Swiss-Prot record:
One of its GO terms (biological process) is cellular response to tumor necrosis factor. It holds the Pfam family PEPCK_GTP. Binds 1 Mn(2+) ion per subunit. This is Phosphoenolpyruvate carboxykinase, cytosolic [GTP]. Mn(2+) binds at residues 242, 262, 309. InterPro entries: PEP_carboxykin_GTP_CS, PEP_carboxykinase_C, PEP_carboxykinase_GTP, PEP_carboxykinase_GTP_C, PEP_carboxykinase_GTP_N, PEP_carboxykinase_N. It comes from Rattus norvegicus.
Length: 620
């Protein structure tokens, strides 16, 4: 079939067989092997022996260190320029711009970045030709969702970073059994490269191979392709997480009729024996992981964790909205995680966990800000910059966006239906962000349409998960601003259309704010385990208890409707204070934002809720 045997990469396969691969799978592997020119090709099988050889390889290349204090835990320190997502270098390629972002009325679109095919080709040809020279191309066959389940989606990631392969083994379900489940079916084509072909022209910081100047994460939904270059951080390199399960999945969900959302899933049980499932959409670094793994302070309540970041939801035949966690592990923020805030997280990360950019103690342990554990005398701390660190400096010992990567099956409170292919019925949906003033502790939407408007009007302070600085209050509708896969105006219409389905059991919609501050600059709510008190009120509202009070913004708890026993000193007057002067400015910013950003793709019912809220506020 060839004249010079120049396209047969069989002699370069150090594990696996190209003959064992399906037709379309082999075409994808050999095609990019010819483009990127790798030295070897490694077809992953997901085995324990393979994981052990990846760790030994990375340990011999100085990429990771062994944390001798714990059981099979490893530390990785990256280049300081490659620490988080780059929303400014994340682009979506479609034929028409309106398929990706609503055409703005004045400024530029904040709902995503669009790039034409012609411009992307020039960028692609300036990066990937010969980028894997001297490196190994790993072929990762992974599954998002329960393997063999009809709702699961299979992808193939090609990467030249064993750090990516190890993390993908934790965060997804990968191995040979996924290749057997695929057969001749469709799959998502994922291609990733660090952008440092050997020999190295640039010296690497902390042995972290990266090309920051040429970083680009592109999505082509019409071709089911994800192409990422330059970065190694999880949000940019683990292509099955944000790039696949959110951006690409959101467009597919619009086509097929389901939902891909940036939400946790938890089940909560009351002292009476009843259990309900909720989902909460908070922006990045705004409390999802701490809520899904919460240890309640109310006796008789139990919280079990289904997922903490991504949910795939769909109405079933009976009218129930059912949700599954497509992920296989947790990729959580490290700073702030202590025994008092998230004790269930501490139990989980003690084994088989890969840390990134946290500090290391001299006895082989981890350390970060807010760990709230004193160290024994003589224990020294090495910061994430691989330097000696003292508690009386300015640089923090761990990076503000440092992460841990741990398997979900090790969580002590993991829900016994987190791998069920049928999903869990969602009875409530929670929105919320970081609002230091004005927004009360909790309130409930008036209807399905008002609730969609509440999610569309979400605002929060900027966090360390992106490149935003200044703690400026930005819009983050549905906590999906960095992850929209298609036109946000059509996104809003897709949510509103669920109220038309026959026998639809629409969940209630709440809005919370754990981050309201007083005049002094400190928080008014302890949060963390005490958030169970707010969840108790939600549980009763779903059961139909008459414990709400009508306000111009929604239903708030009545007086003495929240269990505050054990606190008492809480200033309830400021936790639920509704200032007319605050909400008159808030509706103006929402009006100017929606008019400019959504423009002619704004559904009428969203405009009707904006008008109704403005009227209810003017009557105060
Ligand atoms: N004051 C207060 N802070 C909280 C609370 N819950 C979480 N936090 C802090 O918020 C930070 C973000 O917590 P996470 O739950 O890990 O962030 P996330 O929402 O999962 O963000 P992503 O994982 O990037 O999607 C943590 O470092 C916590 O210290 C809370 O209830 N009250
Ligand atoms: O890392 C994450 O999960 C994020 O950015 O939300
Ligand atoms: Mn997230
Ligand atoms: Mn999280
Ligand atoms: Mn309608």
């Amino acid at each position: 079939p060839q004249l010079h045997n120049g396209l047969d990469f069989s002699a370069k396969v150090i594990q696996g067989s190209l003959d064992s691969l399906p037709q379309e799978v082999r075409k994808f592997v050999e095609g990019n092997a010819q483009l990127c020119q790798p030295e070897y090709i490694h077809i992953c099988d997901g085995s324990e022996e393979e994981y052990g050889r990846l760790l030994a390889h990375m340990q011999e290349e100085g990429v990771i260190r062994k944390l001798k204090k714990y059981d099979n835990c490893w530390l990785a320190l990256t280049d300081p320029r490659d620490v988080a997502r780059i929303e400014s270098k994340t682009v979506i390629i479609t034929q028409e711009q309106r398929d990706t972002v609503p055409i703005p009325k004045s400024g530029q679109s904040q709902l995503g970045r669009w790039m034409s095919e012609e411009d992307f080709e020039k960028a692609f040809n300036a990066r990937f030709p010969g980028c894997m020279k001297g490196r190994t191309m790993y072929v990762i066959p992974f599954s998002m969702g329960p393997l063999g389940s009809p709702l699961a989606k299979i992808g193939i990631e090609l990467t030249d970073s064993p750090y990516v392969v190890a993390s993908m083994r934790i965060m997804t379900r990968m191995g040979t059994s996924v290749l057997e489940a695929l057969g001749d079916g469709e799959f998502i084509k994922c291609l990733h490269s660090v952008g440092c072909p050997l020999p190295l022209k640039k010296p690497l910081v902390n042995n972290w191979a990266c090309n920051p100047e040429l970083t680009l994460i592109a999505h082509l939904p019409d071709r089911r392709e994800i192409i990422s270059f330059g970065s190694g951080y999880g949000g940019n390199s683990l292509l099955g997480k944000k790039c696949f399960a959110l951006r690409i999945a959101s467009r597919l969900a619009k086509e097929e009729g389901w939902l891909a959302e940036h939400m946790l899933i938890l089940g909560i049980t009351n002292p009476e024996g009843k259990k309900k499932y909720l989902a909460a959409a908070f922006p990045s670094a705004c409390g999802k992981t701490n809520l899904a793994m919460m240890n309640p302070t109310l006796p008789g309540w139990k919280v079990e964790c289904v997922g903490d970041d991504i949910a795939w939801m769909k109405f079933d035949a009976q009218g129930n909205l059912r949700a599954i966690n497509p992920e296989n592990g947790f990729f959580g923020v490290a700073p702030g995680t202590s025994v008092k805030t998230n004790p269930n997280a501490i139990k989980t990360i003690q084994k088989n966990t890969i840390f990134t950019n946290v500090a290391e103690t001299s006895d082989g342990g981890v350390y970060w800000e807010g760990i709230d554990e004193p160290l024994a005398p003589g224990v020294t701390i090495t910061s994430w910059k691989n330097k000696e660190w003292r508690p009386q400096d300015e640089e923090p010992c761990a990076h503000p966006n440092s992460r841990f990567c741990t398997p979900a099956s090790q969580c002590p409170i993991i829900d016994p239906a987190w791998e069920s292919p049928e999903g869990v019925p969602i009875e409530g949906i929670i929105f919320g962000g970081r609002r230091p003033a004005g927004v009360p502790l909790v309130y409930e939407a008036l209807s399905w349409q008002h609730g969609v408007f509440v999610g569309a009007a979400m605002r929060s302070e900027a966090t360390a998960a992106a490149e935003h600085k200044g703690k400026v209050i930005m819009h983050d509708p549905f906590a999906m601003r960095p992850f929209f896969g298609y036109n946000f105006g059509k996104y809003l219409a897709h949510w509103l259309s669920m109220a038309h389905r026959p026998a639809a059991k629409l969940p209630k919609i709440f809005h919370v704010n754990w981050f309201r501050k007083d005049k002094n600059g400190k928080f008014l709510w302890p949060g963390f385990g005490e958030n169970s008190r707010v969840l108790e009120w939600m549980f009763g509202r779903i059961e139909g208890e008459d414990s709400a009070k009508l306000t111009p913004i929604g239903y708030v708890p009545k007086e003495d409707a929240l269990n505050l026993k054990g606190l008492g000193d809480v200033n309830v007057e400021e936790l639920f204070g509704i200032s007319k002067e605050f909400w008159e400015k808030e509706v103006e910013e929402i009006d100017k934002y929606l008019e400019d950003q959504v423009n002619a793709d704004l559904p009428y019912e969203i405009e009707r809720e904006l008008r109704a809220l403005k009227q209810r506020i003017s009557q105060m």
